[PDB]
Amino acid sequence: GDLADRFAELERRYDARLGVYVPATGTTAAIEYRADERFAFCSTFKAPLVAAVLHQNPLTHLDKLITYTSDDIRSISPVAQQHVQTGMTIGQLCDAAIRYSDGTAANLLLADLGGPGGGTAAFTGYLRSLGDTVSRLDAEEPELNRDPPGDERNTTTPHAIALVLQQLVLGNALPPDKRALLTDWMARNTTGAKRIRAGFPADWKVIDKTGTGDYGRANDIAVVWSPTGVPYVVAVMSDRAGGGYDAEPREALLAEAATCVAGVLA
Ligand SMILES: *C(=O)/C=C/N[C@@H](C(=O)O)C(C)(C)S(=O)O
């Protein structure tokens, strides 16, 4: 048969555009579907953002206390809005940014990278350093989730983001100790149970970072491990450009796409 047909059938059924990339491995071919089309990052950028902060600092930096006010809560911040009085360490912010997709935490981590545009230029530079000539981040939370479909700002490609995550989690872009921190935060993500996780059998490990936004945007990037401990990177991205800015994102589309991918990999 042809996996591409079955992805196209998902697009028809969900009235959505779907993007998939699984890098080839020692024993498997790549899986690609619209893998070089652009899709908005949404909150999926927070995994490589945490990697950028890790990369650029000794681990003692994770204890640096960042202070902020209620006026800094400008996006959905489940953790940060309950710590305005005490503030949050860079480590706590990393934790929140990944595991709770904390917007304010992401904005504070961007500010930590520093430079023009509140850290957005710095973030894009980190991606360039990892060989990503495609992806760009141009806005903070929450604006980065809400560009129209035709806007290249704040976009990546399944192919590009997959190769970034491969390096970070399974490669040598980070030293082992920084890598383990990123891996753990993603492994204990709380937002992802209905996406790639829901497409893989329960004896597979899944670590992930979700993203959600306007025009029906639903993304998930994961690293999965087979029951024998063989790893693969899975990037799935979707949107519904024809359904209006308020089109409903479809978690089940990512879960079904992931099921298709598990069938190939198992
Ligand atoms: C991260 O992926 C997304 C954060 N926020 C978005 C979401 O759908 O959760 C929005 C579009 C609501 S954000 O307020 O722009």
**How far is residue 208 CA from its own chain's centroid?**
7
The closest of 30, 21, 3 to 221, measured between CA atoms, is 21
Which helix (H) or strand (E) covers residue 234, if one does?
strand 231-239
* Cα–Cα distance for residue pair 116/125, rounded to 1 Å: 12
What is the rounded CA–CA span in Å between residue 52 and residue 75?
Answer: 21
- What is the token pair recorded at 213? 């936004």
Report the alpha-carbon distance of residue 11 to residue 6 in Å, rounded: 9
Q: Are 156 and 123 in contact (CB under 8 A)?
A: no
> Which residues does the annotation mark as catalytic?
43, 141
Would you state the structure tokens that stand for residue 174, as one six-digit string? Answer: 């980070």
Resolution (angstroms) equals 2.0
**Can you read off the two tokens belonging to residue 106?**
């992401």
* Chain gaps in the chain, named by the residue before each (C–N > 2.5 Å): none
Phi-psi region of 114 (alpha: psi -120 to 50; beta: other; left: phi over 0): left
Distance CA 53, CA 107 (A): 12
CA distances from 89 to 31, 69, 95 (A): 39, 14, 10
Which among 84, 103, 117, 91 is positioned nearest to 46, based on CA atoms?
A: 103
- Ligand 1 centroid vs 251 CA: distance in angstroms? 14
The closest-lying atom of ligand 1 relative to the alpha carbon of residue 145 is 15
Question: CA-to-CA distance for 88 and 97, rounded, in angstroms?
Answer: 12
204 CB-side CA count, 13 A: 26
If you measure from the C-alpha of residue 101 to the centroid of ligand 1, how many angstroms do you get, rounded to a whole number?
9
Domains of the chain: 3-265 (3.40.710.10)
Place of tokens 């872009």: 173
Closest CA to 217 of 19, 13, 3, 59: 19
212 Cα nearest atom in ligand 1: 2
Q: How far apart are CA 105 and CA 77, in angstroms?
A: 7
Burial class (CB in 10 A: 0-12, 13-18, 19+), 75: buried
Probe target for ligand 1 pocket from 46, 212, 214, 238, with the most ligand atoms within 8 Å of CB: 212
Angle made by CA atoms 9, 32, 232, in degrees to the nearest 5: 115
